[PDB]
């Protein structure tokens, strides 16, 4: 994405009903920070009801925030993830991206609060921050303080300071169909000898020939007299074979 | 997608004042960072002025600094810029300009532009 | 500071053609510079923005690349609405900075 929306306001994302290969994310080394209760290591075998994308752009030294049972600035009135957070945290360094000369001054985070934040919450109130006894009247003054704080992000800063962007996956799972999973690797095919297969889950043992038996556009299997698997249909060409 | 109109711009004496108003409407005005750009009759844009979601930081051209003042009001969901001392170079059309992504401290890209006034100094 | 040049001044080329427009920032500005367009009697209408991203509006022909200091805003095809007048300008370094702009015509 061209730019992030600042922490206080972290860009939230649903993702559901189609393919994910973490594999080619896991197999690009080119994020600073990459941690997973799920385990990163070929795990796109998974099903999952929604993938939830969570993006914001922090200083390097409070990229170690985010993570379950944290605490911070960032983890108590930016982002707050539960303790029994699933998913991954991933970060990498935009001091080429998010820095600018003079001081790139878009991305805010909230400092000053009355309460913690609750996990996964969200909050962009721009009333100011009652510091003190005194109503703030609408405007920053005496112990009234803005509550959103500019970073100066600039290509000279430490790397601590320096930019970072964070996208954090969330996986839920719960009683629902779970239509994202994102593995589905297939082979070549093999004809007339007895070999090992597994036709969209159906596994058998036998030989694949070609047959003459016509199906119906919406079946895939064909079945004997005593419920035995007889003939199949390749589900990447649109063919019947027999099994023997 | 949201509305910005100019207004306030015409024909004046030598050395006079003028008050430019843009009234935005169909987004939250304190969450955008407004900004006024003159485009001469014979040349290109340049920018003037810009202001930050709020009022409390005001950037001005350089060649327009010391005599014009840009405020902002969420209450009216409106700008204003104020001209000062105009000359016969201060001719050209004034356009409000509005960034598509929430921008608070600086304009940075201008992706939303009114139909901008006219202002004309001459004897 | 920020002063930028773009060329070249004034093109003619006809429909169909590829137009290739070069715009160099006097200091390396990242990826922070807006490309428009604007035809005589109306507004401006940005046709690029950071680097490379185009418009929503704008039809996908319309190309930016480049990064730093050298930019270049490509038309891939040519048609009888292309011929206006291209700007360039920075967004990273107040004052905001325009560049000379580059007028198209039609070659004959």
């Known amino acids: 994405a061209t730019r992030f929306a600042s922490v206080y306001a972290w860009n939230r994302k649903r993702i559901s009903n189609c393919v994910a290969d973490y594999s080619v994310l896991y197999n690009s080394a080119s994020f600073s920070t990459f941690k997973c209760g799920v385990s990163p290591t070929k795990l796109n075998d998974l099903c999952f009801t929604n993938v939830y994308a969570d993006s914001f752009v922090i200083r390097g030294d409070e990229v170690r925030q985010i993570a379950p049972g944290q605490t911070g600035k960032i983890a108590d009135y930016n982002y707050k993830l539960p303790d029994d957070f699933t998913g991954c945290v991933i970060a990498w360094n935009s001091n080429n991206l998010d820095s600018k000369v003079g001081g790139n001054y878009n991305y805010l985070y909230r400092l000053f609060r009355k309460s913690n934040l609750k996990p996964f919450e969200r909050d962009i109130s721009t009333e100011i921050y009652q510091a003190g006894s005194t109503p703030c009247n609408g405007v920053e003054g005496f112990n009234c303080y803005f509550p959103l704080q500019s970073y100066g992000f600039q290509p000279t800063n430490g790397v601590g300071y320096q930019p970072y962007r964070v996208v954090v996956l969330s996986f839920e799972l719960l009683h629902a169909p779970a239509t994202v999973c994102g593995p589905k690797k297939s082979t070549n095919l093999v004809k007339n000898k007895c070999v090992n297969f597994n036709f969209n889950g159906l596994t058998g043992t036998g030989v694949l020939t070609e047959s003459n038996k016509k199906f119906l556009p919406f079946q895939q299997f064909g079945r004997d007299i005593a419920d035995t698997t007889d003939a199949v249909r390749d589900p990447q060409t649109l063919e019947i074979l027999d099994i023997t | 997608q949201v509305q910005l109109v100019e207004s306030g711009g015409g024909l004046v004496q030598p050395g006079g004042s003028l008050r430019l108003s843009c009234a935005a409407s169909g987004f939250t005005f304190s969450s955008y960072a407004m900004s006024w750009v003159r485009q001469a009759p014979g040349k290109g844009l340049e920018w003037v002025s810009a202001?930050?979601?709020?009022?409390?930081?005001?950037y001005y051209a350089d060649s327009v600094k010391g005599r014009f003042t840009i405020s902002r009001d969420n209450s009216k969901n409106t700008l204003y810029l104020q001209m000062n001392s105009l000359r016969a170079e201060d001719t050209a059309v004034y356009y409000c300009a509005k960034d598509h992504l929430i921008t608070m401290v600086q304009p940075e890209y201008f992706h939303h532009w009114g139909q901008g006034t006219l202002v004309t100094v001459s004897s | 500071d920020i002063q930028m040049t773009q060329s070249p001044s004034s093109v003619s080329a006809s429909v169909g053609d590829s137009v290739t427009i070069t715009c160099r920032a006097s200091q390396g500005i990242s990826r922070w510079l807006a490309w428009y367009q604007q035809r005589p009697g109306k507004a401006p209408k940005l046709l690029i923005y950071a680097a490379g991203n185009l418009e929503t509006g704008v039809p996908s022909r319309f190309s930016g690349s480049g990064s730093g200091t050298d930019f270049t805003l490509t038309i891939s095809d040519l048609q009888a609405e292309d011929f206006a007048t291209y700007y360039c300008?920075?967004?990273?370094?107040?004052?905001?900075?325009f560049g000379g702009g580059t007028k198209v015509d039609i070659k004959r």
């Open positions: 202001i930050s979601g709020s009022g409390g930081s005001t």
């Open positions: 300008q920075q967004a990273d370094s107040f004052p905001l900075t």
